[PDB]
Amino acid sequence: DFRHIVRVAGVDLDGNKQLRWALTAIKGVGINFATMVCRVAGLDPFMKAGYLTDEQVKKIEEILQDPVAHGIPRWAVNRPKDYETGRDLHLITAKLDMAIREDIMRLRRIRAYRGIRHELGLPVRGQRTRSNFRRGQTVGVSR
Amino acid sequence: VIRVPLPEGNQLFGVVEQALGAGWMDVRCEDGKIRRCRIPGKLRRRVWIRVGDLVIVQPWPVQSDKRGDIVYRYTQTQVDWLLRKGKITQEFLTG
Amino acid sequence: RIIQTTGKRKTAIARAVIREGKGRVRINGKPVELVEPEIARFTILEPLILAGEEIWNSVDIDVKVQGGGFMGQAEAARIAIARALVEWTGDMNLKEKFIKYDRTMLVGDPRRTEPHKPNRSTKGPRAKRQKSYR
Amino acid sequence: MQKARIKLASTNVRSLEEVANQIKQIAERTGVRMSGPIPLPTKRIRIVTRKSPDGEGSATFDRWELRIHKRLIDIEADERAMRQIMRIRVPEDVTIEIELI
Amino acid sequence: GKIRQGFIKRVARELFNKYPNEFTRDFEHNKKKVEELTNVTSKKIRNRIAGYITKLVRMKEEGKIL
Amino acid sequence: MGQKWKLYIVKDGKVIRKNKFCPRCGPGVFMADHGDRWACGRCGYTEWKK
Amino acid sequence: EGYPAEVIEIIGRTGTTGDVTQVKVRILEGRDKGRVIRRNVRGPVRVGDILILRETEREAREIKSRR
Amino acid sequence: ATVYDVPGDLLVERVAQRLKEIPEIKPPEWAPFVKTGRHKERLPEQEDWWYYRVASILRRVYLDGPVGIERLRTYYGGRKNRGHAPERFYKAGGSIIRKALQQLEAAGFVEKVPGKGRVITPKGRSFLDKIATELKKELEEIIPELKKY
Amino acid sequence: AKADYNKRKPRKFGKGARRCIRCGQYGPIIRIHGLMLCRHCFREVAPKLGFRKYE
Amino acid sequence: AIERYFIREAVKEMLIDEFLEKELRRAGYGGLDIKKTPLGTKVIIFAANPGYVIGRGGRRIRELTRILERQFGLENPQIDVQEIKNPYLNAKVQAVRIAQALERGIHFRRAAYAAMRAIMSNGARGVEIRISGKLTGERAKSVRFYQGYLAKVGNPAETLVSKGYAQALLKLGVIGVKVAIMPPDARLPDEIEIIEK
Amino acid sequence: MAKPSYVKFEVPKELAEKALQAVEIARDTGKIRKGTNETTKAVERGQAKLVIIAEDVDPEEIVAHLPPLCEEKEIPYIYVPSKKELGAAAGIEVAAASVAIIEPGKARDLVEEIAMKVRELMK
Amino acid sequence: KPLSERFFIPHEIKVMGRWSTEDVEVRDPSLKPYINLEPRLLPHTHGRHAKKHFGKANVHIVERLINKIMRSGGSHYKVAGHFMRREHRSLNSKKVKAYEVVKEAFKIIEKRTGKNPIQVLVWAIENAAPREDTTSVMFGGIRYHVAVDISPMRRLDVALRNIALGASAKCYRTKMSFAEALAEEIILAANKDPKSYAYSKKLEIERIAESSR
Amino acid sequence: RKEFRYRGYTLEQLMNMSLEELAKLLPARQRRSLKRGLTPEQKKLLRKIRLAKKGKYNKPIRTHCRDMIVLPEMVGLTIYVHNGKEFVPVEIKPEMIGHYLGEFAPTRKRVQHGAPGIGATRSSMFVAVK
RNA sequence: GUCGGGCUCAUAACCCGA
RNA sequence: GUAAGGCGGGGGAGCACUACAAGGGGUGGAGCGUGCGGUUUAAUUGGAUUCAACGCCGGGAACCUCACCGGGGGCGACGGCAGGAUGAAGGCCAGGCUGAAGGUCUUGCCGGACGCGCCGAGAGGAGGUGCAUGGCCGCCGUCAGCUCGGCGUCCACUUAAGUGUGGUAACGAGCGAGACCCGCGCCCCCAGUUGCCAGUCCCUCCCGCUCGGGAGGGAGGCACUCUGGGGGGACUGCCGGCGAUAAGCCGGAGGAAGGGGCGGGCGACGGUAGGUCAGUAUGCCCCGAAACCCCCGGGCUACACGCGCGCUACAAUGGGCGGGACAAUGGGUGCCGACCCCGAAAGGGGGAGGUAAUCCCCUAAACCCGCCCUCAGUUCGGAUCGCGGGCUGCAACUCGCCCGCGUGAAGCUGGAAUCCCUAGUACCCGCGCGUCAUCAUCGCGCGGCGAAUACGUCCCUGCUCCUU
Ligand SMILES: [Mg+2]
Ligand SMILES: [Mg+2]
Ligand SMILES: [Mg+2]
Ligand SMILES: [Mg+2]
Ligand SMILES: [Mg+2]
Ligand SMILES: [Mg+2]
Ligand SMILES: [Mg+2]
Ligand SMILES: [Mg+2]
Ligand SMILES: [Zn+2]
């Protein structure tokens, strides 16, 4: 009954790892958050992912669609207090990066100071730029 | 605005064609007449001139041909400063 | 009758007390049979293990140690225990064996750290920065 | 009774022992008990400061220090002794404090 | 180098050829008889004068003084 | 330095000062006549002139 | 392999930077067994040591008058 | 026998198992989603991590007198991995310790000294010393040197 | 009034809230155990306060 | 605590003394000492000519106490003038006397020789004067005079030699003076005698 | 106190003397309130004792303030011949109008004579 | 891990309480008075020797082995390829850890071979000690590199350092640990096997020393 | 996706909220700054924006206070902000509320680099000073 | 041959990398 | 021209981990913290450039600091002039200009003598000059020199040393070295609170049920530790061998300690036109209604690039989770905050005791035991960015610090070159003070754990003496 590749919520994940570490392959889940959803779905976080039957994948995917309505606190979600509505949302692989893209386009529309630094590709959180952050290539005077 | 040795009185601009040695430098002036400049005593110690750098000089009206005298020098900060205002034209350096 | 002695090792003072008994020895309340870093348990056992299963089973010792660290307290306890065992019994064929083996079990160690000087001053007296010509 | 408690403190350690000994005398000449001068830990204050006015040269420092010595005395409350300890004429750099317990 | 100092010798001689029978070959006797015959107020300085006097009394009592 | 001290509503036969006093200080110090309020002059009052 | 020798006298410090020492050794088994020769050693040496050497006929070049 | 006669961690392991019978000790319902301090990085891995912390706090006021919360936070602190900067010590949180002491107090094992902290009652001394004796009785079967005392 | 534009502002924290008692400068001021002096004025008047340089 | 009391009363003396230097430069200020009795203190000022410090019938002293009570602490001050104990062993005074003789117009080699002669007459062991400024030229110089024994390095030359410094402003610039004296009862450690019978 | 181009009455010389010479002696002893537009208010309160109003002010608008107001107070006053002497009697060197004072010290006999003279004479 | 081995109580003065140095035998007459094999229950002397000339002669050999692995590796000389700069995760002043790895090495050596572990170590530190070398000599003006002889104390020091460094490379970024890489080095040296590091270094020293006689 | 909503509230809806029920919908910085009150200069600026909003003050609004927090009273009008030398027009739109006022007026000019000069490398230092 | 870094108080000569 | 002896790729002797030799750890290659040169700007304020410039000017700058850029507004003791009690200098309710302002103006009141519209002078100046000075400081150098009433100060040997002993046209001296001062390690006397608890005695509680063992209080005592005033102890003194038998040097006993006992303070006559006029003092030259004094907003925090000093790593000589162990220096009234309650955390509300051996900061980390990971760009590494919650402050966008969830860059051991260290030292690990309203990858100190090698040479890099 063992399976070598299981597919849960989009991406398919390994079958010879501990369930808590196979769920990290999803972009939008870390190790602190995967432990929570294994403890809420009610199954051990040390079992090998390949032993997941179908009902358990269904429960996991359900918990991934609204974590607050199942027991996860609301200080432990991906983005709390959504900008369009005051809900508490946790987003994953394909809809997470679209949110960040729109969050940067908003700052670029009004021409804020933090959206222009995104335009130019320069440091945004106030670092110093004389000695580090050197991504370009050398220049000379003469030899 | 700025403290630059622009033309003040009877000034000239020095762009040397060749150094023969012994204090004589020959400049390719827009005049056409080859001016053979010399050196005073105050600049032969603290500053240091070479070939190809625009400098300032003072001529003497004697024949208005072989004359000239440096009294101050130009930096690298100013060589391209004296171009945007159009005070001097660069094409006489390349033609 | 009872006796009491002293031992010191780099900011670690130890006070021991000996008397007639059954053979049990406690250090701060812990029996020496239960001390975890074995390299520290074998240090406080030599003065006893070198005197035999005979003198060991006629005394009760208890040491009060404070200061220093887990290895600077074991040697303080050892000095205290040897200095006490050499007085209770009062025989010198035992003081002989305590000096062929280790002379400091009975005279002590006078070494302390050295004040640091100013070039880094937070690394040591003689550690300095890194020179740089050019 | 009432075990008055005198507390001296000073920087010159020589100019302290003589006041302590005056009090020791005054107690001995009379009939009254006294707890000998109890030494409390010295309180040295220390200040490190760079030695040059500008910033050139290697950096070398100073270590200035000021030490302050303290004592403690208990004594029974007798007018024959209290009166005598009131004309004792402390020197200038000696600070004295009395308070009944 | 444990070189003897200049004023140690200069006094250790001056009070050995002035009282040439008041110093024996013993160290601890000299140390006392030195502290009372001079105004030395240090302690490392009377130890060294006592040592030099001992070395003088053991050389002049055996033979050739140099 | 010119001359300006007049128009106190003062005549001959009798005198009736035009601007009243400032209650804050005693008598003597007069009032202002801006046209909407009575301004002290050096005290502090905006009682909306009577 | 190798015949041993016993160090009985030191002569001083040779070496381009003061590292080797010249000594006088006495062989004690093999073809010679008793001849006294001179050799150079690298390291700290006492009297009474026992070196292990592999040639027994080299006779280190004499030192500059020991001084 | 007392708790001075045995190794501490084997005792804590044995005491935690007994603590699962007192119906007053039960983990708060925000326990599956927390870590124990700002100096840690990941959440506790064993499922009964509550019982170990409680049973370590009980043995902790037994042999350290009247003690309060802000001193049990310095014991349960540690070193931090704060990125590119050098390591540094920090205290621990408070709720995990406060709930533990309140639940122990409701069990009867500790109590409150007015203005000094918390002590252990005769009932708690009985509880710990009995288990310590039960542990030592089976630790003389392998080290026959603990027989003496 | 013309007496409102030569008058300072009363800071109470910052480098401009403490100045040397003897020189009058802002910056490197010792504030240990009360004393309030430049690091330059202390070093030249410490022997008269009673400090000594033992070690 | 207590150290804050011990070093709050050492700064008041320092400020009062440093003000009195400037104020009483002439007539030769020597030094002071405060005595704190109940209900008030007692200030003593060892000048060298009480005539200038007291005033005309004592009208300078009124101003002095008014300042010493308003601009400094000293809730109830009482001044009285004195005379220096030994003016020729107090280098901090000879520095000022040489400085004044300079800025009055005397050559810088008569001043120093006269001063050294007086100090070594009144019974000192040895003296050292060092005058360094723009004397005789436009480039600075420095000269040095000395007479007898004088320790320089070590603990005995930190407690036994008395030393002072003073400026002598002139028409061209300043000139620094530095004097140092060793009193006639010194006794270095090097000096031992044989207590004989 | 208007210009002499105002026929109020005649002016004698004795009161002039013993009232213009009444100021210096009262100046070295009291508190002086010079000028006109200053003590108009003090006499509005009525505190100034011996006011001394002259006849020199021109033009005739700011000139008659007290003669309309003398009829409501006690106004112990005189008339003054000219101005320079009034500036010299107290204060400064300008053309003065009414140098009124309070508390004439040592100068009360002249008060009792000529002040009550001018009181009983006219008002 | 078994409590009978976690709480260990010795009753006798043997080295580390487990093995006895009575029938070990130093065959080499040169390295006889420098290999110390006296009773010495515990091997830790708190560095009281490195103050007197020729002092480290009376220090038990097991302790010299323990002191010479409290290092990081090769920090200014490449050893078998690379540098081995291990900062902040080296056992530079941790003696407890070095003591444990030497104890575990000895427990593995006693099992694969079946002999007293110190007999094997004393065999190994004689096959790794070289007896010829090379240096320079200044004389009249020039130099030229020659052959010299090695004194026995230096032989012992070089042998021990070479065993330490040879064992300290087989455990670098490899699946093998350090307690067992320290046993695989000793077992291999005492067999005069080429795969060693300490034995090969003696061969390559003696060879290029003979080349220049 | 056509109207602007901040937390589910439209503009004219979040416009008549008070200053304490709104600050629950702002980030932590803005809430704390609104809770310690407006500084007197921001009070003089708000006193002048509420005139320009009702009927009066047809005259360009200028300010130095780069710390003002864009609030739903200021949506529509164009104010000028001092960037160190000039007053820069910053028209206020929804999606600006919450942000600081200086966040839309830059203070340093963009740097477009030239060519290294003498001393820029270790090969041009000692061959040029003579 | 070109840019960059090393060695020297600094330039030449010399060593290394792109 | 802005104040008319030393050296030599010569010879001897002697030294030093900022020299080598024998060793331990690294830097140089990747990312970031910070200082510098250079480019950019309205300004990105200045000084320092081999050792001896570059976490240096105690320089961790949000306002102030501040010297820089854009704007606004103030100040001439004192002499003598225009004018001035018919009222000089000066102050304000409301409203305009304004970033905001009785600063100016509209509007009318007030105060009672002076008077920058004028002339001379004067305060004040982080304005020039450190190449006009004083004071202070770094380097030759803690080297052995520099001189007085060419020699003496040279030669042989000796010393850390111009430190000593002999021979000497030399004999006597001074300052520097030494002596001197502060700590550390061993023993004794006097002291016993706020420090200490061993032996006796009362009282309560717990365990194998108590014969034994343990834990807290109060009665008592200075026994031990400690605190700090005074004393002792070590002198080449004793034994053996070199050297003359003298100066001295090697080895050993006894000793807590051994050959300046170990670690620090104190830097001669002079030079370096070395640094500082931007710590204070000061001559000359310049600004003097401005280069002086204040207030608002920007800047020193910009970023194709070359360099210095560091922090974190490239994994098993480890990462994570849960348990268990042991310090010292210092600081506290504008401040330290035990103890109870609220929160998941940062944090929030009450609040004893402390002006100090009395109460607080203050149950350190590396280390040990159990389980998961198994050589992989990973359960290594933690830059970079999104959303949300807090603290200090009059003010956090430029441009502060802290917390939770998410994202997951280069990096798989480093070319030529090059630095620091000789014993409780170097390496590894955390802590306290300074600066401080808030902010430590820094300076200065503290303890924890604890080695390898050599007791030597003048080969390289330097310095001191005699000679040529
Ligand atoms: Mg080159
Ligand atoms: Mg600023
Ligand atoms: Mg200079
Ligand atoms: Mg010299
Ligand atoms: Mg210069
Ligand atoms: Mg800066
Ligand atoms: Mg990780
Ligand atoms: Mg900010
Ligand atoms: Zn100052």
Author numbering:
A (entry chain O): 3 to 145
B (entry chain 6): 13 to 107
C (entry chain K): 2 to 135
D (entry chain L): 1 to 101
E (entry chain S): 2 to 67
F (entry chain Y): 1 to 50
G (entry chain X): 5 to 71
H (entry chain U): 2 to 150
Give me lines lifted from the publication on this model.
Density subtractions of the head or the body parts of the 30S further improved map quality. 34 modifications have been modeled, 19 in the body and 15 in the 30S head. The C-terminal tails of the three universal proteins, uS9, uS13, and uS19 contact the initiator tRNA. Here, the position of the C-terminal arginine uS9-R135 is further stabilized by hydrogen bonds between the carboxylate group and uS19-R124. We modeled the C-terminal tail of uS13 entering the major groove of the tRNA anticodon stem, with the guanidinium group of uS13-R145 facing the Hoogsteen edge of G30. The electron density for the three terminal lysine residues of uS13 is missing. On the same side of the tRNA molecule, just below uS13, is the uS19 C-terminal extremity. Side chains of uS19-T123 and uS19-S125 interact with the phosphate group of G30 and uS19-R124 is stacked against the phosphate backbone from tRNA-G29 to tRNA-G30. In uS19, a short α-helix (residues 125–129) follows R124. Finally, faint density for the three uS19 C-terminal residues (130–132) suggests their positioning at the edge between the P and A site codons, close to W60 of aIF1A.
